[PDB]
Amino acid sequence: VQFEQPRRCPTRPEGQNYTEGIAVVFKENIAPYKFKATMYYKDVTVSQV
């Protein structure tokens, strides 16, 4: 018999390359559009007594 010769050792992974950057994450808009209005009307009351 002979002894097994040294095995090929594994290699450490290269490591994930990361791009740095700035981000803005947008979501679907569910808020209603809001604005200001003015109602002009007249309450008309006819009372039969």
Next chain:
Amino acid sequence: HQLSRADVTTVSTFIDLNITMLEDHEFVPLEVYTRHEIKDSGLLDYTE
């Protein structure tokens, strides 16, 4: 005579250690009830 290493019986002094990497997993979006479903659960919608 002459021999190769393959022609000789091989015994190992090495202790085995089989380490495997944890595999990449993807999480899909998942909701029990969508917000549309929750809105629709009401019997009467005042706006409509």
